[PDB]
Each structure stands twice: as structure tokens, then as C-alpha cells.
Design an enzyme around this catalytic site. Structure first.
Site, mmCIF file in Angstrom:
data_model
loop_
_atom_site.group_PDB
_atom_site.id
_atom_site.type_symbol
_atom_site.label_atom_id
_atom_site.label_comp_id
_atom_site.label_asym_id
_atom_site.label_seq_id
_atom_site.Cartn_x
_atom_site.Cartn_y
_atom_site.Cartn_z
ATOM 1 N N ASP A 140 0.826 -1.226 0.000
ATOM 2 C CA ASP A 140 0.000 0.000 0.000
ATOM 3 C C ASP A 140 0.860 1.277 0.000
ATOM 4 O O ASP A 140 0.517 2.308 0.649
ATOM 5 C CB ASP A 140 -0.909 0.003 1.228
ATOM 6 N N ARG A 191 0.502 9.414 0.792
ATOM 7 C CA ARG A 191 -0.375 9.504 1.990
ATOM 8 C C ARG A 191 0.113 8.657 3.168
ATOM 9 O O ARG A 191 -0.228 8.944 4.318
ATOM 10 C CB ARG A 191 -1.817 9.097 1.659
ATOM 11 N N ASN A 192 0.907 7.627 2.863
ATOM 12 C CA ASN A 192 1.416 6.669 3.849
ATOM 13 C C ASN A 192 2.856 6.928 4.325
ATOM 14 O O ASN A 192 3.415 6.126 5.073
ATOM 15 C CB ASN A 192 1.345 5.257 3.249
ATOM 16 N N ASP A 233 2.510 2.654 7.399
ATOM 17 C CA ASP A 233 1.392 1.888 6.814
ATOM 18 C C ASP A 233 0.122 2.097 7.641
ATOM 19 O O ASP A 233 -0.032 1.496 8.714
ATOM 20 C CB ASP A 233 1.721 0.398 6.769
#
Ligand SMILES: Cc1ccc(NC(=O)c2ccc(CN3CCN(C)CC3)cc2)cc1Nc1nccc(-c2cccnc2)n1
Length: 244
Positions: free
Chosen positions: A126, A130-131, A144
């Protein structure tokens, strides 16, 4: 060994929320330091499975990965506690608009953290701006928190074939978000259009002002064949060996 007594932690702000629990900024009274605190909403999953996240994290130590500080597990609500990053998500930080050398530095740090993960035989699954989190002195760390079609490599969408090479694909997209100051990728296009176009060979064009050398690395990340994408180690050397 990682248990922290609950009274040592004081919650101060809701950072974000969800279906398995929420995240707050807090204070760790001992160290006089800010922390992020992730909570288990009771009955959304087992305590055992919630804490498997902390178990993984106890095996990992690197300057560009979010550091676990400990857990509060003696009673509900269960907590996982990490360092707090003063400037929040990379994406939000990019969205305030720096030099291409500083943008490069940020990318290298992510690659660095991913390389460590790769080396320890983990996958992210992922990866996205944004992470990643930003602290002082332009320090960047991979985290995460946590579709999403626009970050997901073709073989992953089609065959559910996630791997470290599907992560390299997502790092190409992240590189694009970095060098666009946090624009949403494949602008205007819907997901099904993205899946279709990408399959037929479409790639996002070079962003405005982005160095050709940087763009060339994004294209390598987006090779249709996974075995031909660069490793995260290779990727870091490439970034360190770009000059100007
Ligand atoms: C509070 C917490 C609890 C857990 C985590 N966990 C992780 O960041 C993480 C990172 C890597 C792995 C390893 N990896 C996951 C992918 N799978 C497939 C295997 C290996 C696991 C967890 C971070 C934090 N920190 C966290 N969470 C959300 C937001 C913030 C945050 C927000 C703003 C400012 N500062 C911090 N901080």
C-alpha cells in the site's frame, strides 16, 4: 518488554479514524515527547490480530521507517504507540509547495526504507505519499495506515499478484506525486479507464519541471514486466547518482 503503562500516555488530538479503530496524537510523560497512538475498536477484530502489527514492527529498525515505541495491552482499549512526525503526511506537506534536490532527498529516504523492508523479506502492499510521514530537517519515514487502482501495478490488479515489484510500481507513482507537489495521479481518468489505458501501454507524461533523469526512473518502475523493474536497492543508487 514493549508494554508501556497506560497512565504515562495522555491523548491530545484525534488525527484520523476508521473501522478497526482510530489514531490520536498524545504525549509520553516520561520522555516529554509527542506520540501517535493507534487504538483497537473492540470487536472489530481480535486483540491477537491487532497486535500482529506490533509483532512485525518489533523486527524492523531503520531511520526511514516509523519507530514503534510500545503497546498498552493490559485492558481495552488496546494501543500501539509510535513516534509522532511534526509535519504530518508527505502528501499534505507537498501540497503547500522547495528545490528539486530536496524533492530528490525525500524520494531517496523512501527508497531507503523500502530497501530495508525488501532486505528483511517484507512487502508494503500500500505504498503511496499519503502513507509516508515528514518530520524536522526534511526527514521522511515510510508508514502503513490503511483499490487504490492508480497506485496498483497491472499484475496486481489482474492476478492479485502483489510482490516487492508491485511495490516498485507504486514507488514510481509516489515519485510522480512528489514531483507534482501532491497532485492526484492520472488526472480526470476514472479507475476502469486507468486499468484499461495502463494495460495498453499508457504512462503518465513527464510532470512540469521534472528532470528527465527522474522521469526515466519512473518509467523503469512502471515496466509492464515485474522482473524488469529495478530493485529498491538499485533504485536508491540511481537517486543518489543524479546531480545538479
Ligand atoms: C500509531 C501507529 C501504529 C502503527 C503504525 N504502523 C506502521 O507504520 C507500519 C509500518 C510498516 C509495517 C510493515 N509492513 C506492513 C505491510 N505488510 C504487508 C508487511 C510489512 C507495519 C506497520 C504506525 C503508527 N503511526 C501512525 N499511524 C498513523 C498516523 C501517524 C502520524 C500522523 C501524523 C503525524 N505523525 C504520525 N502515525
Amino acid at each position: 518488554k514493549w508494554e508501556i503503562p497506560r497512565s504515562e500516555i495522555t491523548l491530545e488530538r484525534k488525527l484520523g479514524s476508521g473501522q478497526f479503530g482510530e489514531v490520536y496524537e498524545g504525549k509520553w510523560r516520561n520522555y516529554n515527547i509527542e506520540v501517535a497512538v493507534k487504538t483497537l475498536k473492540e470487536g472489530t477484530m481480535s486483540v491477537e490480530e491487532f497486535l500482529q502489527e506490533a509483532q512485525i514492527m518489533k523486527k524492523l529498525k531503520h531511520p526511514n521507517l516509523v519507530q514503534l515505541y510500545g503497546v498498552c495491552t493490559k485492558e481495552p482499549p488496546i494501543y500501539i504507540i509510535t513516534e509522532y512526525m511534526s509535519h504530518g503526511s508527505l502528501l499534505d506537506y507537498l501540497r503547500d509547495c522547495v528545490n528539486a534536490q530536496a524533492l530528490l532527498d525525500m524520494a531517496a529516504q523512501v527508497a531507503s526504507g523500502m530497501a530495508y523492508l525488501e532486505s528483511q523479506n517484507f512487502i508494503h502492499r500500500d505504498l503511496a505519499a499519503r502513507n509516508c510521514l515528514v518530520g524536522e530537517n526534511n526527514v521522511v519515514k515510510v508508514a502503513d495506515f490503511g483499490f487504490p487502482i492508480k497506485w496498483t501495478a497491472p499484475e496486481a490488479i489482474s492476478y492479485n499478484r502483489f510482490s516487492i515489484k508491485s511495490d516498485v510500481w507504486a514507488f514510481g507513482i509516489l515519485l510522480w506525486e512528489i514531483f507534482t507537489y501532491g497532485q492526484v495521479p492520472y488526472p480526470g481518468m476514472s479507475g476502469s479507464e486507468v486499468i484499461e489505458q495502463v494495460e495498453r501501454g499508457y504512462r503518465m507524461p513527464r510532470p512540469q519541471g521534472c528532470p528527465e533523469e527522474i522521469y526515466e526512473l519512473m518509467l523503469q518502475c512502471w515496466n509492464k514486466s515485474p522482473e524488469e523493474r529495478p530493485t529498491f536497492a538499485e533504485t536508491l543508487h540511481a537517486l543518489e547518482t543524479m546531480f545538479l
